[PDB]
Nucleic acid binder design. Structure first.
Length: 30
DNA sequence: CTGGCCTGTCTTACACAGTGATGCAAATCAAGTGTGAAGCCAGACAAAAACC
């Protein structure tokens, strides 16, 4: 799932390179 | 008593196995280095899986 989540968020966060720990937490929380 | 004529030894022809040498084409080396391609790192965590 995590790849798809991050791919969707590529536009959600306009140009940010997101953290590993926090992105894990977010994909986890959904 | 002597052939023709239906049968196992004899006699070389003949292919070729394989020897160390040979000869030519094609890698290879050697130097310079800046790339690009590639597997790996870390941490919180959840899938797809088998164990009581």
């Amino acid at each position: 799932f995590v790849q798809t989540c991050r791919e969707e968020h590529k536009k959600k966060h306009p140009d940010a390179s997101v953290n590993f720990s926090e992105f894990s937490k977010k994909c986890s929380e959904r």
